[PDB]
Design a protein around this ligand. Sequence first.
Ligand code: ADP
Lengths: 37, 360
Amino acid sequence: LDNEIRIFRSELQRLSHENNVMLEKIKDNKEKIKNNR
Amino acid sequence: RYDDQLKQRRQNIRDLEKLYDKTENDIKALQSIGQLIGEVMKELSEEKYIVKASSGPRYIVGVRNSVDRSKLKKGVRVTLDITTLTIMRILPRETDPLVYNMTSFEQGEITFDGIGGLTEQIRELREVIELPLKNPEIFQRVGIKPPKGVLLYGPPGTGKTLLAKAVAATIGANFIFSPASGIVDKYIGESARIIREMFAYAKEHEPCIIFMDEVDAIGGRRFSEGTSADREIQRTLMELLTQMDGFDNLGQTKIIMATNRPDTLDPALLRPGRLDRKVEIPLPNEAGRLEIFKIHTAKVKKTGEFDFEAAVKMSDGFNGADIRNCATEAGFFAIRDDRDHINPDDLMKAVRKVAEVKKL
Ligand SMILES: Nc1ncnc2c1ncn2[C@@H]1O[C@H](COP(=O)(O)OP(=O)(O)O)[C@@H](O)[C@H]1O
């Protein structure tokens, strides 16, 4: 199962990119409301 | 090993797609700033209506493309912008369930009504009101015009609110009831809007009965000075009359009213042909009070006896609604003697205070 970690690490590298992205667009709106509050 | 470290991520992401869509929803609403509320007097053209705001003035306005000019007529409630003042949207059904509420099971056709006191009334209203509703295609060809309305007067403290609630429920009629207080208590100068809605709602749920107490409140000044400050106390009678004249008296809507002081009534209308049939109502008698005391007192853990007969013969000069008090006038002495099953001694001295309570 050597090819496992050579592969199933790749997806892990992806979802971190998927997480930090979605983590910010909410931060964007999270500040807007305070500007209009 | 390196699989579980990822399996927590597909859960992570979907746990944000929920979060995102919310924070993206709200901004989609904040741009949609508020509006202002009004009401209509009349109509002039599809390009120009009239309104009356909820803060005084009587603007003139235009109207947007979408809304049907058909539905826009008098009486309607309206919404519009703040600067241009152009009407866009409508909201009907000025709900106030504290005001009224339906009794659909009153359209059961077999409902219970077995409280005491009165039989010929429930016997006769059945005559006054059943036939014009169930198969009224005969009142025309015979020749006469049936009664558009009714009035039920009497002394206070008699429990008639439940009566009219009942007999329209056994007959199988959709009953609704609203006092004439909140319509003038909650709603000072926005009242008669409720009236017409109370009928339209009542219409499309035809057949149906009305009931409404404290009806002597519409009078107010009754044009006691003709000043333009009591427009509410004046118009609130107007919209009442114009609407009940609009029934045509076919046999799918009838009306009931009530108070204590019919001599205080406003026969500016409601006397001649609107509330045509006037019906007084009696008080109990030598056995009705046992027909009454068999109701309330029966519903509590007494000792079990029949001093009622020897009791009420001592009673006299006795109104009706003082009886929920009379039992509890005794209930406030059973607990004092640290009891569960009371005796008639509390009842034999029950009224002995209550007779003086009628003094003031
Ligand atoms: N005939 C009756 N049978 C049972 N209860 C009655 C009767 N008459 C009056 N009551 C009592 O009086 C109260 C209802 O009176 P109410 O509806 O206030 O009269 P009105 O509508 O004329 O003011 C209730 O608590 C009820 O138990």
